[PDB]
């Protein structure tokens, strides 16, 4: 994991050109900073 040189902050909008990223980028309203599919994967094992 630790190969990124600097951690960029999550952008405000989640919609670039039509591509919907709201399922893979997190959102502030939910209590957990984990993303949607991340929190689904974490449920299954």
Partner 1 sequence: ATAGWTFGAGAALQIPFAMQMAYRFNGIGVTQNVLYENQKQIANQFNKA
Partner 2 sequence: QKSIVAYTMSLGADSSIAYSNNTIAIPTNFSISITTEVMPVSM
Partner 3 sequence: ECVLGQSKRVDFCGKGYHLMSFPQAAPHGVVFLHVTYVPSQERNFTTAPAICHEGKAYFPREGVFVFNGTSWFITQRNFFSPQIITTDNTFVSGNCDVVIGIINNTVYDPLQPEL
Ligand X SMILES: *[C@@H]1O[C@H](CO)[C@@H](O[C@@H]2O[C@H](CO)[C@@H](O)[C@H](O)[C@H]2NC(C)=O)[C@H](O)[C@H]1NC(C)=O
Interface residue with partner 3 among 10, 22, 24, 30 (CB under 8 A) is 24
Given a contact cutoff of 8 angstroms between Cβ atoms, the answer to whether 24 and 18 are in contact is no
4 φ, ψ to 5°? -85, 135
31 interface partner picked from partner 1, ligand X, partner 3, none, CB below 5 to 8 A per type: none
- Identify the helix (H) or strand (E) that includes residue 15: strand 15-16
Q: Which stretch binds partner 1 (CB under 8 A): 10-18, 26-34, 36-44?
A: 10-18
What are 16's strand-pairing partners?
19
Residues that bind partner 3 (CB under 8 A): 1, 24, 34-35, 37-38, 41-42, 45
């Amino acid at each position: 994991f630790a190969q990124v040189k600097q951690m960029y902050k999550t952008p405000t909008l989640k919609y670039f050109g039509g591509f919907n990223f709201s399922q893979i980028l997190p959102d502030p309203l939910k209590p957990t900073k984990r993303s949607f599919i991340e929190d689904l994967l974490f449920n299954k094992v």
